[model samples]
Target chain A: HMLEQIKNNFTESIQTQIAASELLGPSIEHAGMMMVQCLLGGNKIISCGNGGSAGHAQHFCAQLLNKYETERPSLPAISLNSDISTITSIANDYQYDEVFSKQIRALGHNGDVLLAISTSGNSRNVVKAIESAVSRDIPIIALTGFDGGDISGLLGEGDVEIRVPSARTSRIQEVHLVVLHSLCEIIDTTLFPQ
Target chain B: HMLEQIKNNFTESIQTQIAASELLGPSIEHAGMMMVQCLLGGNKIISCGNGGSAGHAQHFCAQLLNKYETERPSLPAISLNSDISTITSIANDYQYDEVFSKQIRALGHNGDVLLAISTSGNSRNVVKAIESAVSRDIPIIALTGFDGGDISGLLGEGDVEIRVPSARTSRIQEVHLVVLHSLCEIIDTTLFPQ
Candidate 1:
């Protein structure tokens, strides 16, 4: 029984990837262009999310800050969740949902990119982050699943949303990983063309 | 050309998934058995890794500590890199390689499992952590990529290793995400049979 479940995990993930390939590429490309320009303009990216989403956020930031597939110089990015002192202090002084938003307002500016992830598309903190990024004149790239909750409603002219076409949280999250890898691949080739 | 690369990302990931499925199941079941009993015995999992691997470690812990596919009671698990203060002090007080090891010595005991992820199988701190975990009588689960670097050599009697066959870091990390979800599925069902 346990073995069957393990096999099922791969099958479900494979099917999700096949479906996502049809729908997600264009928005991902759009987001990649925005991010490349942000870096070219000497601006950094601000990343925010919850749980597995934070995992993706930091991993993406780490890849950019270090290297992705091939070696490149380095791109500037920061995960708001990486600092415990600031997070605890924010969740202590104000609302828990304001943790990411507060950090964005302080660190972000025009030409910067904000990657907000929410598997359920319903994280209050991520929602608050998008709000704050807008006021700071930063562009948004939202990773959402299901109905995209209200996050899809939050995007403006230049913002990009790559919503996975799934309802299950785990499955949705799996597709999200592929999306990040795609972003890495695109970003690497776009920057170096090598 | 950018669009062509995006297409390659999906195809390459799909090929890796097909290959990983053939080789990874049995060890995943083995790791799941160990983790379920560890949880039942009131023991926790301590996960360690670097870069994108750290993302996997923390995301896996967050799922176990919260919920995965279904609703369940919280489980005990922690990511060694979660606390910035501890990490800063450790890297400052001693070598950076001591970060995970020092925390394991302080927080781990017999029956705990250490999950060390090094995509290249070459992380010094994670290797240092394996040494610390064994001294405390903890079992190990290693997520390694390519030739498994030195990490494969580091495993002993009760350890399980999930080594992705690919040499590319991006493909390897994508497969690592799938392995994590498989563990989540098995652990959830093995514990509750739901």
Candidate 2:
């Protein structure tokens, strides 16, 4: 019985990804192009998210700085969530929502891009980071799900929003990761076409 | 042209996942069952991976320890990659292969389970962690891609391996994330039973 439910959930999750492709593919491509442009312009990417999203942020940056699949030059990307000391001190001294925003204010600058990921599109820290990006004249590529929460509302011109077509957080995150990989692949192939 | 390629890659990735479903489903189900059994036995889960896989290790642990889809009691899960200090210290002082193994020696014990993730199945650190788990009577759930690399050969009687069928690292990692979510969902549904 448990095994059946597990299989059912797995199938449903994949279905969500297939449904998300039509909604998110174009936005993801736009975001990928923006990232490629930012990198080509010698501007860095700064990413912020919470929990699982934070992990995804780090994963995205790691693939950029390291390698995704094929060998290439290290791209400039930073995950705001990876700095534990800064995160802890900021949360201790100020508030949790300021953790990413403070980092964005310090590390982010004009011409840089912020990849803000929030599964519910409503994480306060991620939203604050978007606001910080706006203040710094940084464009954003917001990744969100479930009616494209407050984070979606914050995006405007020069920004791209890839909203996963799923209400379930797990399903949303699953698609977010694929979207991240797609962006990496697109960037890699564009910069180093073989 | 880039957008077309990106969309093509995205479609190929999704198709690879669909192909992986038949090959990986049963093993994923078995791995999920093992995780549930381990957690029910009051044993903790320790995960280790490299690069993007490391981010995945942290992501999996965060979901288990925090919450998956819905609110639940915090499950005991430690991502060996989460401790930047320990990881860097080990890599600097010793070797990179010792990073996960050393932590496993310190934190893991009999009755615990290790979640080892490697896209190529060839990360030395993850392989070392599997060896350490073997020494301590800790069973393992190895998530690998491609030909399963050397780590697949390391599994013995009590271990479970979910090998993604695709050769592309991006496609494999995508499937790996979905499999991780399935495990989380199974564990949650079995324990909480909504």
The estimated TM-scores of all candidates read: 0.95, 0.96
lDDT of 1 by residue, A1-194 (tens): 77777878888888888888888988888888888899889999888888787888888898899898778888898999777778889887855889999888888878899999999888898999999888877899999889999898888868999988888787787788888888887888888887
Off by over 4 Å in 1: none
Steric overlap count per candidate = 0, 0
lDDT by residue for model 2 (A1-194), tens: 65666566668767887788766767887888899899988899998887887888998999899888778989999999888898889987756879999898888878899999999988899999998899888989998989888887787879998888889888888888888888888888888885
Colliding pairs, model 2: none
lDDT of 1 at B128: 89
lDDT scores of the candidates, listed in order: 0.86, 0.85
User: Model 1 chain A — which ten-residue stretch has the worst lDDT?
Assistant: A86-95
Q: Please, what are the lDDT tens digits per residue for candidate 1 over residues B70-174?
A: 779988999997766888898878558899999999999789999888899998989989988888889999998899988888778588999988888878888
lDDT of 2: 0.85
Model 2, chain B only, scores a TM-score of: 0.97
| Tens-place lDDT digits, model 2, residues B29-138 | 77887888899898999998878878888889988888887689899999998888898899878667799999999999788999999999989999999999999988
